[PDB]
Ligand code: PRO
Ligand code: PRO
């Protein structure tokens with residue numbers, strides 16, 4: 001069958017991937033006792049947008065549920081799936097003649113049917129008529145709450161839909177649950193996004209020089225990913241934190257736009273991941289700007305390397321993700337005590353939630369078509385109201401096919417440290433005279449992407465990780481990638 | 485005073501630029517008979533957005549009118565200007581403590597006052613109280629129609645605004661008119677955006693090889709612009725049309741995403757321009773993929789070079805822009821006849837609107853904070869209802885301080901050519917035996933950015949343009965060219 005491909009060495013993604021997702025969705029819906037025979041899933045694709053009131057077009061990236069089901073790159077589409085038969089119909093815009101002048105070839109419906117391997121293609125202006133003739137019992141539309149944004153996913157609508165019976169409650173939890181478990185075809189794409197992003201991270205480590213701006217490495221990363229990987233988008237805005245900025249978890253946004261000069265002695269924390277055909281990656285590498293770890297940098301870094309590998313070594317089906325978060329906390333506290341930043345009973349530190357002072361974010365999250373992927377908190381799974389753990393993007397138990405980031409870190413964040421020092425229950429553990437040396441250190445985060453397997457995990461990421469590996473990588477002479 | 489700067493060799497942009505814009509706006513409003521004493525201009529800045537219902541942040545780019553007035557890069561702001569005194573107040577978001585962890589330093593109001601050189605800074609939730617205490621006669625808000633998108637610009641609103649007298653008709657045409665005329669400080673930035681984008685176009689011409697994907701050059705262009713120019717954004721999505729795709733005017737969007745393999749014998753038409761601190765550039769270079777113009781390619785290319793230079797040579801204050809469009813049409817028709825593609829009376833060809841078959845778009849447009857900048861069709865300026873001319877983005881007369889693109893082109897667009905061949909009023913001019921040779925040629929566009937001056941124009945763009953200059957550049961030559 002047909003495949004998506006951007007040529008050269010980029011990955012061929014079979015459109016059969018999306019056909020399988022549609023099949024899996026139907027199979028799950030058929031098992032739901034509330035779903036009536038003759039139901040039709042109706043999804044609305046993303047539309048083209050502009051900057052504010054201007055005619056400046058924004059590059060179109062497909063809505064994630066619609067992509068998951070259909071893999072369609074064009075704006076203005078709808079897609080439907082007959083639940084009982086699995087038959088798929090794509091609706092494409094009926095374009096005006098001038099499209100041929102300004103935008104490109106006006107493809108036929110047959111072209112799209114062949115391109116996407118759906119059962120039928122019709123024009124968008126005919127959706128009401130086509131759905132009417134199919135005599136559905138109910139239209140199943142998509143509405144639910146994203147548990148990372150808190151936003152409500154907005155259901156499909158079209159002129160004439162009011163003539164139909166519409167249910168907007170059944171679909172969302174079911175299609176979310178399908179997205180949580182990656183097919184082998186999806187895993188091949190995530191292996192690829194991790195491959196290219198790993199290569200790009202390595203090029204960045206090789207290219208970093210004292211005196212560069214953070215954004216020069218953001219630029220290089222995205223250039224490698226696009227030109228060599230066909231990744232036109234990043235999965236999220238690149239986080240290129242040097243020095244104290246490495247303590248800022250989502251650094252790099254418009255308000256703090258990767259505009260610091262990298263200085264001798266800085267730690268770098270680069271959290272970047274290219275996106276291919278709307279599939280994510282998310283990798284974080286931490287390393288000394290000047291290519292040589294100081295003793296303090298080595299100690300902090302190897303603490304996070306220890307929790308990283310301990311968590312990965314413990315992950316397997318049945319493991320409760322919050323237990324892995326707490327494992328990382330305990331290891332960080334042990335290591336920080338060995339360094340002399342902390343003193344006392346680590347058991348007592350844990351009871352006082354001291355780990356969250358140093359790692360205020362969740363250990364890791366589902367990853368897929370969205371970098372913070374759906375399904376972390378389905379009905380019945382509750383958010384734990386404790387420091388650190390409350391930022392976990394899932395409290396589920398691990399099962400095969402789940403894809404997770406594993407991203408422990410240790411940071412020196414002034415307002416968290418100061419809070420802790422004011423609290424007698426935590427302050428006794430902190431050795432101020434030692435901690436003072438680490439103010440402005442920033443932080444270390446080591447982020448791998450992994451798949452849960454029957455017996456443990458598969459590691460998707462491949463970057464240097466030991467102190468020796470990193471120093472060797474940065475000292476490498478290889479001009480494998482030299483723009484200009 | 486303070487400056488915007490991204491370090492290295494990037495341009496320092498004084499915040500005095502925006503203070504001057506505010507002053508110019510007030511001065512214009514004070515002369516406006518509809519404006520009362522005690523009026524306050526109220527603008528609302530752009531807000532942060534996400535992809536659909538996800539928490540995937542979209543990189544924030546400021547709304548263009550708000551940028552013009554304040555130069556503010558942070559999302560969630562408002563800004564007001566007291567018309568009678570020119571006093572400026574910036575309203576910034578009151579951030580949650582957790583911002584310090586995830587997003588970065590929670591800057592003081594004084595930090596922002598100093599950063600932006602405004603007269604006062606307040607928190608956004610205090611805007612109703614602050615405005616109330618000033619006892620304004622009327623709030624002047626922004627509402628009007630963009631004549632390129634047809635969209636209505638969104639006026640500012642805040643909780644409590646209903647307690648004020650609000651006028652939303654006066655401001656838009658006045659602030660648009662200010663934007664039409666660039667200050668010397670604004671011209672410094674547009675000189676810079678053209679410098680970097682010109683350098684990037686030159687790097688692309690040096691790097692292009694047969695067998696590359698179009699998007700590899702898009703990536704390279706953007707990487708040059710960001711890493712060397714500090715241009716995090718492009719002004720619009722890169723148009724990298726090879727072969728037949730060079731006849732597609734806005735090629736490169738999601739539906740036609742720069743994914744063709746460049747072939748020997750192809751013409752390339754690359755329309756790309758980096759954006760610096762929300763100031764545009766827009767440059768188009770046309771060249772043979774293999775670095776050597778064929779005779780046919782040379783002929784089409786030099787026809788557009790002739791119209792380009794004729795227009796630039798004719799432009800000066802008082803010139804009616806549609807007359808320049810018609811001048812380009814006439815030159816294209818003359819040269820196409822000189823090539824044997826057309827025969828007969830060129831006067832008659834013009835009368836038959838034959839020029840629009842080969843150049844279906846407008847000769848050029850205002851450029852500024854938006855690539856298709858505001859103010860092309862103010863009240864009283866009408867769109868000309870003829871092929872080609874109706875696509876003009878302005879029908880104004882040129883005056884000093886206007887910035888325009890000059891972008892004639894010749895394309896071989898099958899459905900337009902076939903229309904002409906079916907039309908007895910046009911068909912006899914076309915020589916099919918020669919024209920058949922140019923089917924699938926694509927097209928040539930040569931686009932310069934220029935400023936209208938007292939004596940003529942100032943050319944901002946600096947790329948190779950003659951056949952010899954282009955072949956030299958592609959062969960790797962250092963500035964082997966001299967501008968018009
Ligand atoms: O947002 C999250 O969950 C992770 C934590 C650090 C950056 N990304
Ligand atoms: O949109 C416009 O006006 C010009 C014409 C060619 C591409 N950009």
Ligand code: NA
Nearest residue numbers: 271282407447
């Ligand atoms: Na991360």
Ligand code: NA
Nearest residue numbers: 282405407447
């Ligand atoms: Na992550």
Ligand code: NA
Nearest residue numbers: 755766891931
């Ligand atoms: Na253009």
Ligand code: NA
Nearest residue numbers: 766889891931
């Ligand atoms: Na243009």
